[PDB]
Amino acid sequence: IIMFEDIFVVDKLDPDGKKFDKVTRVEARSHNLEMFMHLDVNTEVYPLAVGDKFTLAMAPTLNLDGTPDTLADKYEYIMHGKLYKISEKAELYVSFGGLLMLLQGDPAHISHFELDQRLFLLMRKL
Amino acid sequence: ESSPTKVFGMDPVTRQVVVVDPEAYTYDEEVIKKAEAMGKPGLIEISPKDDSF
Amino acid sequence: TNRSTVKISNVPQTIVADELLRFLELHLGEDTVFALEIPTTRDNWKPRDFARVQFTTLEVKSRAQLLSSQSKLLFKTHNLRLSEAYDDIIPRPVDPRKRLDDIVLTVGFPESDEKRFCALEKWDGVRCWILTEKRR
Numbered sequence: 001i002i003m004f005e006d007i008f009v010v011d012k013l014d015p016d017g018k019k020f021d022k023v024t025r026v027e028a029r030s031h032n033l034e035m036f037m038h039l040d041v042n043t044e045v046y047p048l049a050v051g052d053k054f055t056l057a058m059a060p061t062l063n064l065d066g067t068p069d070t071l072a073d074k075y076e077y078i079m080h081g082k083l084y085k086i087s088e089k090a091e092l093y094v095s096f097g098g099l100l101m102l103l104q105g106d107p108a109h110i111s112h113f114e115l116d117q118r119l120f121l122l123m124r125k126l
Numbered sequence: 127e128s129s130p131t132k133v134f135g136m137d138p139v140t141r142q143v144v145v146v147d148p149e150a151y152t153y154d155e156e157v158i159k160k161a162e163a164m165g166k167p168g169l170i171e172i173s174p175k176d177d178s179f
Numbered sequence: 180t181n182r183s184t185v186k187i188s189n190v191p192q193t194i195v196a197d198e199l200l201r202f203l204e205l206h207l208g209e210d211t212v213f214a215l216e217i218p219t220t221r222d223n224w225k226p227r228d229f230a231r232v233q234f235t236t237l238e239v240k241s242r243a244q245l246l247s248s249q250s251k252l253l254f255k256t257h258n259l260r261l262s263e264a265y266d267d268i269i270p271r272p273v274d275p276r277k278r279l280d281d282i283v284l285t286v287g288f289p290e291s292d293e294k295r296f297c298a299l300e301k302w303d304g305v306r307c308w309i310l311t312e313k314r315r
Contacts, residue, residue, distance in 0.1 A: 012260075013258070016188075016189055016257065016258045016260065017256050017257055017258065018167050018253055018256050018258065019162055019167045019256045020256060049250050050250050050258075051248070051249075051250070162256065163255075165253055165254070165255075167253070167256070
């Protein structure tokens with residue numbers, strides 16, 4: 001059910017602030033696959049410091065064996081969004097209700113993603 | 127001294143702050159702002175209680 | 180590790196050098212900061228986003244780097260990031276032993292064939308610095 005799943009390590013933060021009361025964009029580089037990622041995260045509700053390691057997963061649906069549109073107990077930062085731009089080292093542009101995500105990796109790693117589809121974002125900081 | 131009202135107290139025997147009369151906080155974000163200015167973001171956390179009035 | 184100056188990535192635009200010096204002396208040891216310079220785009224009223232700080236001892240620099248790597252430096256809701264600098268603010272050796280103060284300097288030449296030396300002009304209370312990195 002999970003299409004893409006890899007361990008990511010953050011590198012730097014765009015605001016580099018603790019109590020800025022603003023959405024923070026993170027830059028995390030994948031291990032092994034070595035895929036650069038941009039993601040907007042809220043630090044106040046989901047703290048994330050530099051050097052931390054977190055896992056990331058993407059699934060079309062949260063149900064088991066079909067039923068598109070029970071993985072909630074495993075992860076803790078589930079999001080929902082759609083992929084609108086796929087043109088690039090291919091990269092993906094997924095917006096989770098205005099929160100842009102840029103997953104830049106290799107053309108072979110990202111091959112089973114269609115245009116204008118709904119996908120989730122499963123995250124856990126170990 | 128940053129709190130507009132007498133909601134926090136100082137204990138001389140322990141040299142630490144204590145909470146006295148918590149009902150007079152008036153939800154004035156002054157102590158939290160002072161803590162943020164001093165450099166401690168998670169020093170004091172105050173949140174309203176939904177089921178108590 | 181060759182030098183002692185550390186370049187801070189991001190600092191607030193509203194701060195002054197004195198505030199940053201006080202913050203560094205509070206977090207690190209007392210009076211462990213030698214030189215602190217904040218570049219300004221204008222003459223005296225528009226500082227830049229970064230600053231360069233020179234430490235007295237390499238141990239202080241290593242401790243500051245360790246603190247920065249753990250994101251333990253928070254000055255006015257800004258996370259200070261430490262990176263290596265290109266050139267020192269002041270060409271001063273890190274080792275206090277190489278610094279010689281109040282010594283006698285004289286010039287001359289091997290005037291005689293034997294083990295004799297001639298003094299032309301003698302200076303007192305001169306400062307001698309040995310720069311191994313700069314080879315001078």
